[PDB]
Amino acid sequence: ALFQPLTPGSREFEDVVNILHSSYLEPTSVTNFNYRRACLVHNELLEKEFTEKRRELKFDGRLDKELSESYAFLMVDRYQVQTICEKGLHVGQSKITILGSPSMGVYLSRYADLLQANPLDTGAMGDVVIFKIMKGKIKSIYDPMGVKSLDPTPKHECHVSKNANRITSLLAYRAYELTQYYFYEYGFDELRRRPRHVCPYAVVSFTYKD
């Protein structure tokens, strides 16, 4: 069973909602999102490869700090929750370029209230996939200023924007793109199309009221 529906008000339901509530860029976004349904994702194949990747990272010397699990988010269109939760998140599904080519990595939002470039419209409805991730050893990069962006940095698990903590407002210029995580993984001689240190964990449906 890939999806396990959770009953609203239950412990498991409020745990998933608590991941979202604790991950806002503006914690007062708690008044604007109503999470009306939620499922845990149980994809044994993806969880196997996440667990395998974590033990390889520890084999290659990453610190226990770098082995920690955290969460990141993706708002998903056209009822494609099914494909990402069953197949995993693949390269080429984002149009963001700020941290490297989307053909070489996958982009996830750091903040659960910052899921698209422009503000959400009142009454909007959406589906948000919650991924568990290992940021591992992070490569911090400056946003591009007339220079070609880097290929994914070998021996690091993701790219992040160097000064993203400067971002405090959902309306700051390019807040959405500057608060992304960029996950990638080199195979042997090729970039993997699906980084294994990203794994779908839960799905929620929301309505938005500003």
Residue numbers in the entry: 111 to 259, 269 to 329
From the paper:
HUSH is a complex of three proteins: transgene activation suppressor (TASOR), M-phase phosphoprotein 8 (MPP8), and Periphilin (PPHLN1, isoform 2). HUSH is a vertebrate-specific chromatin regulator that represses both exogenous and endogenous genetic elements. Here we show that TASOR is the central assembly platform of HUSH, providing binding sites for MPP8 and Periphilin. Structural and biochemical studies reveal that TASOR contains a catalytically inactive poly-ADP ribose polymerase (PARP) domain that is dispensable for assembly and chromatin targeting but critical for epigenetic regulation of target elements.
Bioinformatic analysis suggested that DUF3715 resembles a poly ADP-ribose polymerase (PARP) catalytic domain. Despite extensive trials, we could not induce the wild-type DUF3715 to crystallize. Hypothesizing that β6–β7 loop disorder precluded crystallization of the wild-type domain, we purified a variant with the Δ261–269 deletion. Validating our design, crystals were readily grown of native and SeMet-labeled samples, enabling X-ray structure determination of TASOR DUF3715 to a resolution of 2.0 Å by single-wavelength anomalous dispersion (SAD) phasing. In TASOR the key residues required for catalysis are even more degenerated than in ZAP or RCD1: all but one of them are replaced by hydrophobic amino acids. Based on our structure, TASOR therefore lacks the chemical functionality and physical space to bind the NAD+ cofactor. In particular, the loop connecting the final two strands (β8 and β9 in TASOR) spans 14 residues in TASOR (Tyr303–His316), compared to 5 residues in all annotated human PARP family members. In TASOR the extended β8–β9 loop has elevated B-factors in the crystal structure, and broad NMR peaks caused by fast T2 relaxation. We have identified that TASOR activity relies on an extended loop unique among the PARP family, and a single point mutation (Y305A) in this loop is sufficient to abolish transgene repression, endogenous LINE-1 restriction and genome-wide H3K9me3 deposition.
